């Protein structure tokens, strides 16, 4: 369970509207919910069990964990196979013992409109940015510590 | 409604500079990039270059390097865009276009989704 | 950059019946993360152009069933069930996966008779 205090192996925290999740850095994958490690181009003996792709390692073939399915050449949740969110994503209602949708920050689940990512809503950044010089901002839809607005860049200057 | 409003359309002497506006509303300006596409008469579409309203980074096109120049204004929402030197072959409709805020990292937004109405820029002596 | 060819370069339809527009790339459009990015646009005559499709098949707010994306890799078509009035007009693909951006060269759609 990825919470406000998880701290992200070789990557860092974004929050949506509904959760947070760890985005690798670089060319990474993830192995876990926090942890993130280079993936290799082909399997064979020497590379067996080694990861391949999110959720997914490596009669050679990379296979999602169970639990995911390849879905447009990626490992999504089960649950999230006939799911689609548009200004969003889906992810397991940690609240239900389910597919739902996380949506892009501006946009909430519209109950007018079956929970999808079409309703206009303000979501509060959790995140705590431990870096000096950091804080919460705003990109691309997501929440992410960034250098705040005098510093930019090794570390944040 | 993450609507877009361009600047009028403007007229030019061949060696001047020419200046377009592109007013952002509906959203959070300083959370997303834009990318300037112009068209010239009867042809296709042409990537121009991109901005990044979140951290400033502008990256132009190598064809068209060393006569571009972009900013964006916080205060007033509002992406610019400057072409020096207009040839005659510059003659073409901009469009404004919304795109992501880092080019290093891709999230769950995908750039180009809103369009503006477009500007006529026309060059000639 | 990534060469992006769009055939046919016109493309005669009949009201009503389906169409379908190729679009082919340079270089392999997966991304890093695994994700494709080819987007499709409509510009009408005298309009701004509008994404249709954007990442693999998925379509954009406000776009008509009739409208819908397929393909992988390099090889991609946006495929028309059934052709309206409002549907003339040049279509345009673009891709993202790789810096620059590069849109195709056009289909322009017309009525046959």
């Known amino acids: 369970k990825v919470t406000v205090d998880t701290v992200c192996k070789r990557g860092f925290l974004i929050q949506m509207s509904g959760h947070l999740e760890c985005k690798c850095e670089n060319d990474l994958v993830l192995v876990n919910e926090e942890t993130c490690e280079e993936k290799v181009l082909k399997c064979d003996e020497k590379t067996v069990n080694k990861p391949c792709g999110d959720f997914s390692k490596c009669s050679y073939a990379c296979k999602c964990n169970l639990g995911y399915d390849m879905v447009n050449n990626v490992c999504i949740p089960n649950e999230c196979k006939q799911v689609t969110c548009g200004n969003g994503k889906c992810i397991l209602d940690t609240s239900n013992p389910t597919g739902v949708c996380s949506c892009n920050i501006g946009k909430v689940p519209n109950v007018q409109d079956q929970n999808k990512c079409s309703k206009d809503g303000e979501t509060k950044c959790s995140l705590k940015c431990l870096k000096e010089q950091e804080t919460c901002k705003a990109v691309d839809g997501i929440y992410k510590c960034d250098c705040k607005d005098g510093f930019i860049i090794s570390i944040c200057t | 409604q993450v609507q877009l409003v361009q600047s009028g359309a403007e007229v030019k002497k061949p060696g001047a500079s020419v200046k377009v506006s592109c007013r952002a509303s509906?959203?959070?300006?300083?959370?997303?990039?834009f990318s300037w596409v112009r068209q010239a008469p009867g042809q296709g579409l042409e990537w121009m270059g991109w901005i990044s309203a979140y951290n400033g980074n502008t990256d132009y096109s190598q064809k068209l390097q060393g006569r571009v120049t972009m900013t964006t204004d916080t205060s007033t929402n509002t992406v610019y865009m400057e072409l020096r030197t207009l040839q005659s072959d510059d003659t073409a409709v901009y469009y404004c276009?919304?795109?992501?805020?880092?080019?290093?990292?891709?999230?769950?937004?995908?750039?180009?989704?809103?369009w503006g109405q477009g500007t006529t820029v026309t060059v000639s002596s | 950059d990534v060469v992006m060819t769009q055939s046919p370069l016109s493309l005669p339809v009949t009201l009503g019946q389906p169409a379908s527009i190729s679009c082919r790339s340079s270089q392999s459009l997966v991304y890093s993360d695994g994700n494709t990015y080819l987007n499709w646009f409509q510009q009408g005559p005298g309009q701004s152009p509008r994404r249709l499709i954007y990442?693999?098949?998925n379509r954009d707010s406000g776009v008509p069933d009739r409208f819908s994306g397929s393909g992988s890799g390099t090889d991609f078509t946006l495929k028309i069930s059934r052709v309206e009035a409002e549907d003339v007009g040049v279509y345009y693909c673009?891709?993202?996966?790789?810096?620059?951006?590069?849109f195709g060269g056009g289909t322009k759609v017309e009525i046959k008779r």
């Open positions: 990442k693999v098949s």
């Open positions: 509906g959203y959070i300006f300083t959370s997303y990039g």
């Open positions: 276009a919304r795109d992501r805020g880092d080019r290093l990292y891709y999230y769950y937004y995908y750039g180009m989704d809103v």
């Open positions: 673009m891709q993202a996966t790789h810096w620059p951006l590069t």
